[PDB]
């Protein structure tokens, strides 16, 4: 689960494009 810590961070929007 690397996309859990992703989603709260503000998904692609505050973090970084859409990752493996």
């Given at each position: 689960?690397?996309?859990i810590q992703?989603?709260?961070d503000x998904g692609p929007?505050?973090?970084r494009?859409?990752?493996s």
């Open positions: 689960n690397l996309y992703w989603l709260k929007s505050s973090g494009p859409p990752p």
